[PDB]
Design a protein around this ligand. Structure first.
Ligand SMILES: [Zn+2]
Ligand SMILES: [Zn+2]
Lengths: 517, 266
């Protein structure tokens, strides 16, 4: 239960098995459903849109993110300026622990507000100017709407605060983590400099000189390592002034501005801010509470997966909608040049309403009524029977119907129908790969299945990606002086970002098969 | 045993097929009250005909997602209703009479019902039903309203609804094909690939007919159950003990007689 077990490619160039102790708190945090869903999403992403070369780097990044999330969860968990500080941190922890409940409550409140909004009525007379007011016999909905609007605004504000307390630390952690990696192993601001059209790199400069650069990232030796790696070649004084460190120490408005910039560029934070703004506009005009019904797309995973079918081929949907416009424009040109006499949409004899005596009017008429008509433009425009251009006109109508109504809408619907099957195939392929190959070492399940339940044992004990994350957390928490020999070996390999200690293509059984059996 | 009979009757009354047959009998009884209650027994074809059951399985495979997209259509039509009720109230007069107007969007509930009723069922959307906007101040906003309604609701949402069914057909077909491929390329009892047995001609056929026959395993289990404990032989007693302790380790997994004695046999 607490006894951990991983296999590494040891210094002796052989597979070695490492035993360590796992904390019950870490095990419970791992078993939490949020972490389970995060792991599933990561596995899907790497199997689907990932390369075999970078699989271990991606896996280590996932492990680091999961470790930081567990640390934040442990921080927010629960068992005269001091009094207000204690109360404030308690309130913030409560908001962080109930962020998702607050989001669900906000969705419910929006639904209730809109259901009450379904009873609004418009009258010229008071209960030019028109008076909008509720019309219900019960009388409870009129105060209920005001109470629910106040509650919805409060819940939206609490959701913003909870997000800032919970999911912003991870964004800042990843940002600082990536900046440190690029600074050390790429010399981004020492050797190359950013692209300059890269908004992120330019903003990141503001934080290099700050004393609190590794505020969330664990490694506090980021600057010292970069100095040792680069200063000897590129100027010790220049590196020190760039990184804002003092060279005689061997015996933050800018940081806050940079942090706020990252927060304001965060997509989920922007979405929650827009949600709060619309909730505020709701008190101005209650029908602005109808823009919070769009939150179901982010709320319900089933609806999100359904809409993913539409958005999988969204670029091609836009392309085919823009192609429909060009085809209808060509039909408009032909109509305006040759069949102007059929586009009289006025029943009155004396005054004619000619829809194709102007190019813009004809194009609007086509794109409006011809596309939405069941049989095309022939349904709307005048019948050509007994006319000189009857055959040209019937060819016009038939080709419009076939190319636009039939073929183009068939393409639009086939894109969605194909997107459904493509997403299904992606899920099936990920499942098949995860059930027929080992993630860490990439050895087929047939080899392990010679022993009954061999692949199950290999994926549960020998090569467990949960155990690897537990070992990484163990190394990070353990002291450098306290590290044992193999732990120091793996720690050095991790510090140099060398993923060669992961057994790739080899395992304990494959190495000692002759002796074991 | 009154308690045992009560428990048995509770299980019977919770049985789904028993409840279905009880409902069938109740509707048959109501038929004598009103003969048109015999039309509720035409729904029995779904349970009766396996072909129709498999056809309806296409609809029911993604039934949760069908309900979800029907509930999403309601929200989208509600947003269009809000926009209409706020801005285009003047186009929703469905009365040919000049003096008395029938305004379908002077009330939020009436407008929502009008949209969900006629706009969804119309071929071109709500623009077909409501008044033409030509020569009006809000003509462009109104044509954008109509075009987006047609594309999002009539085209995209119904395309999603039909794509769910079309995908369900292919998914069921793929399930059947995968089961057939697994059953024809791997052995059920021991999980050894057919390629190994196919070195001998008809080797996999012989393995699945004589060596590892899941019919033979059921026959042996019935034989053990019927046979007396005292009459059991040695290996039969071994398997009987393993069965009593619910230990399925006597099933050969990954090994077979041929694989074990290949050197001696050939
Ligand atoms: Zn492995
Ligand atoms: Zn077998």
């Amino acid at each position: 239960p607490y006894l951990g077990r991983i296999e590494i490619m040891g210094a002796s160039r052989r597979i070695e098995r490492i035993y360590f102790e796992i904390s019950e708190t870490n095990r419970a945090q791992w078993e939490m459903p949020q972490v389970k869903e995060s792991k599933r999403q990561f596995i899907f992403d790497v199997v689907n849109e990932g390369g075999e070369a970078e699989k271990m780097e991606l896996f280590v990044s996932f492990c680091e993110d999961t470790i930081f999330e567990m640390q934040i969860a442990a921080q927010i968990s629960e068992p005269f300026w001091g009094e207000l500080e204690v109360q404030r941190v308690k309130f913030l922890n409560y908001l962080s622990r109930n962020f998702y409940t607050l989001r669900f409550l906000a969705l419910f409140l929006a639904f209730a507000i809109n259901f009450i909004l379904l009873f609004y009525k418009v009258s010229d007379s008071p209960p030019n100017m028109v008076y909008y007011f509720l019309e219900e016999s019960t009388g409870y909905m009129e105060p209920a709407l005001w109470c629910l609007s106040l509650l919805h605004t409060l819940v939206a504000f609490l959701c913003i605060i909870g997000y800032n307390c919970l999911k912003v630390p991870l964004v800042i952690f990843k940002r600082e983590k990536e900046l440190a990696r690029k600074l050390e192993f790429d010399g981004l601001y020492i050797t190359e400099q950013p692209g300059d059209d890269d908004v992120k790199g330019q903003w990141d400069r503001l934080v290099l000189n700050t004393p609190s650069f590794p505020s969330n990232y664990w490694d506090k030796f980021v600057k010292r390592k970069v100095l040792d790696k680069h200063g000897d070649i590129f100027g010790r004084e220049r590196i020190a002034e760039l990184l804002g460190m003092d060279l005689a120490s061997l015996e933050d408005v800018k940081y806050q501005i940079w942090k706020f910039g990252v927060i304001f560029t965060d997509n989920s934070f922007l979405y929650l801010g827009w949600y709060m703004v619309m909730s505020l506009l709701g008190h101005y005009n209650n029908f602005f509470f109808a823009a919070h019904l769009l939150d179901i797309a982010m709320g319900v995973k089933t609806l999100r997966t359904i809409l993913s079918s539409v958005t999988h081929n969204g670029k091609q949907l836009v392309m085919t909608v823009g192609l429909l416009a060009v085809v209808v424009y060509l039909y408009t040109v032909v109509a305006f040049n040759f069949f102007r006499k059929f586009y009289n949409k006025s029943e009155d004899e004396d005054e004619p309403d000619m829809k194709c005596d102007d190019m813009m009017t004809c194009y609007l008429f086509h794109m409006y009524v011809g596309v939405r008509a069941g049989g095309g433009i022939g349904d709307e425009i005048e019948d050509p029977a007994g006319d000189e251009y009857e055959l040209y006109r019937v060819v016009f109508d038939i080709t419009f119907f076939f190319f636009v109504i039939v073929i183009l809408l068939a393409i639009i619907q086939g894109l969605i129908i194909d997107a459904f099957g493509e997403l299904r195939d992606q899920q099936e392929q990920v499942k098949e790969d995860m059930e027929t190959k080992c993630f860490i070492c990439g050895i087929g399940s047939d080899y392990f299945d010679t022993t009954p339940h061999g692949f199950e044992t290999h994926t549960l004990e020998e090569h467990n990606l949960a155990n690897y994350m537990f070992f990484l957390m163990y190394l990070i928490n353990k002291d450098e002086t306290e590290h044992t020999g193999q732990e120091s070996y793996v720690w050095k390999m991790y510090q140099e970002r060398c993923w060669d200690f992961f057994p790739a293509g080899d395992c304990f059984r494959k190495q000692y098969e002759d002796q074991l059996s």
